[PDB]
């Protein structure tokens, strides 16, 4: 109603392209949201590498 | 806002020693203050200075021996050709005999004569006499 779209085609070609936008950034906040729990895990698996042999070496040296 | 930090220093130096005081409190402390203060003290125009450590940029205390007419600064720090040091030195120095135009070369801080022997040059900084 603000005369945004010349004809019916330019309205769908905008709608289509619009969905192709927010679903292009839904997949960026999927893939770039995945490496965050990769490095809250792979980085906190290294917290049980360094802390489970220090737990042991306090006990394992008697 | 405080924009030179060096000129704020050489003023306080120049001020008190022209009012008769022997000692001056400088702040903050640039490493460029220090290198200037060096060439000053080593050429006699000032005494010995002691850096002070804050957890800030730090202060200085300079002992004044008298005998210093003016320490000063050229802002902006011009680019200076080599042949154009002669036309600076003739300008602000009291006589061709003594006095020091102190530049900043790529070799680092020095006076105009020390520059002349090395055959270097750079931006201008200040003066001492």
């Amino acid at each position: 109603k603000g005369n945004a779209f010349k004809h019916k085609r330019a309205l769908v070609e905008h709608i289509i392209q619009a969905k192709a936008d927010a679903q292009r950034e839904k997949a960026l906040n999927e893939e770039a949201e995945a490496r965050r729990l990769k490095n809250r895990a792979a980085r906190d698996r290294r917290a049980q590498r360094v802390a489970e042999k220090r737990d042991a070496l306090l006990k394992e040296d008697a | 806002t405080r924009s030179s930090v060096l000129a704020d220093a050489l003023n306080a130096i120049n001020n008190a020693e022209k009012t008769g005081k022997r000692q001056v409190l400088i702040r903050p402390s640039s490493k460029v203050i220090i290198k200037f203060l060096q060439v000053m003290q080593k050429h006699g125009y000032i005494g010995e200075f002691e850096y002070i450590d804050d957890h800030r940029s730090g202060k200085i205390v300079v002992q004044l021996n008298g005998r210093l007419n003016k320490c000063g600064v050229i802002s902006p720090r011009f680019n200076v050709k080599i042949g154009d040091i002669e036309k600076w030195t003739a300008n602000l120095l009291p006589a061709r005999q003594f006095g020091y135009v102190i530049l900043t070369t790529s070799a680092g801080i020095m006076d105009h004569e020390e520059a002349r022997r090395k055959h270097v040059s750079g931006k201008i900084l200040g003066f001492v006499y």
Binding site: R54, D61 | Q41, K42, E48, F49, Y51, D53
Partner: protein, 186 residues
């Protein structure tokens, strides 16, 4: 598992090992002086001449372990200094120093401020004194141009270093080539 040659690392040497076997004797007394002293080990050791009637003993450390080396420290240096006399015991840090890049040193990997030369030297004079947190500092620029960094030590419980000031002064000279003087509040 060999207790005697594990605790160090390169191969050698007869003095570095001698100081190691001294920890071993301190590793058996009481239950808690063993397993707590157990994990704390050290890298190599230097011995440099002090102008007094003694010498300085520098114990380098991998520096995660200054966390626990500090927890004992004075406990050891009220002991290891009885073990070895005519010698002064210090606990240092082997922390690396990355130089200042221009051209002959090139192409990135940054330079965090710890690992910086000047910032590192200020952490050696923090670890030469280890107790007695410094309450202030300053630096004299000479009339010959040279420097004396005047380290202003605390007062409360300074007696542990109250003598070795030469040995701290001699350490920083055999490292940095520039000098030191200490002092107190009057």
């Amino acid at each position: 598992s060999a207790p005697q040659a594990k605790i160090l690392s390169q191969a050698p040497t007869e003095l570095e090992l001698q100081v190691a076997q001294a920890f071993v004797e301190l590793e058996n007394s009481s239950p808690e002086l063993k397993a707590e002293l157990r994990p704390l080990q050290f890298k190599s050791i230097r011995e440099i001449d002090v102008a007094g009637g003694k010498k300085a003993l520098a114990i380098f450390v991998p520096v995660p372990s200054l966390a626990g080396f500090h927890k004992v420290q004075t406990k050891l240096t009220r002991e290891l200094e009885k073990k070895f006399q005519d010698r002064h015991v210090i606990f240092l840090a082997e922390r690396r120093i990355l130089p200042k890049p221009s051209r002959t040193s090139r192409q990135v990997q940054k330079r965090p401020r710890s690992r910086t030369l000047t910032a590192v030297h200020d952490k050696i004079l923090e670890d030469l004194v280890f107790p007695t947190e410094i309450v202030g500092k300053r630096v004299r620029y000479l009339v010959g141009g040279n420097k004396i960094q005047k380290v202003l030590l605390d007062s409360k419980d300074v007696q542990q270093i109250d003598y070795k000031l030469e040995s701290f002064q001699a350490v920083y000279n055999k490292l940095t080539g520039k000098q030191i003087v200490f002092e107190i509040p009057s």
